[PDB]
Write a protein that binds this DNA or RNA. Sequence first.
DNA 1: ATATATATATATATATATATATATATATATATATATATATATATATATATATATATATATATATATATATATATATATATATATATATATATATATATATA
Length: 131
Amino acid sequence: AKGRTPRSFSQRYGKWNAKFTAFSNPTVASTILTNVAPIAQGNFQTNVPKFTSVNEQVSAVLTQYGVTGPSRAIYQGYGLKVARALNRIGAGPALTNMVAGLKAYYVSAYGANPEILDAVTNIILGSPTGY
DNA sequence: ATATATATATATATATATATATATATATATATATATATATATATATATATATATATATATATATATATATATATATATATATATATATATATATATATATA
């Protein structure tokens, strides 16, 4: 019972503003954050290593291909996207569909190189196509 | 008449706390007139070096607190578009049971 009736801009703004004002209270914010601190630490600890490893390995791959500067961000981003999919739905035909869709996305919108996208996918999933 | 605590009249001696008239000496706290030296706290005239707290002119690197231009990922507080489930505080459509005013 959260997204059942349509909300106009005034309703969204009113509720977002009420909640932002409530959270700015010292007691409210301190209580909520001190209560969710251990769970946040646990979620960070279980999830971030999988992505720091991807950062390191895609860096290694990008240095061998001569990519420098902000153009590295492109492929780094691509890598993280693929890793996200692997963390979300697992390996199988769905991951294959998403890898193909992400390659199409990046090649068509950001002018990425298909060879380096294959190289990043090979270092992450084990093969260029990801099977 | 004797012992004690005091004030006197008359000269003198001894010990102590002070003020003088006369010159000199010693130790101490100071202010001066005349040059010079030593240690200490400062302000200067002239160049230079060392350590420290800052502001600059010119490029570059490192750590920290923030704002960006560009796509992406992770944790956190929220508002949405679409259907579904769990826990909690409510109001209803329909009959029924239990506890309470």
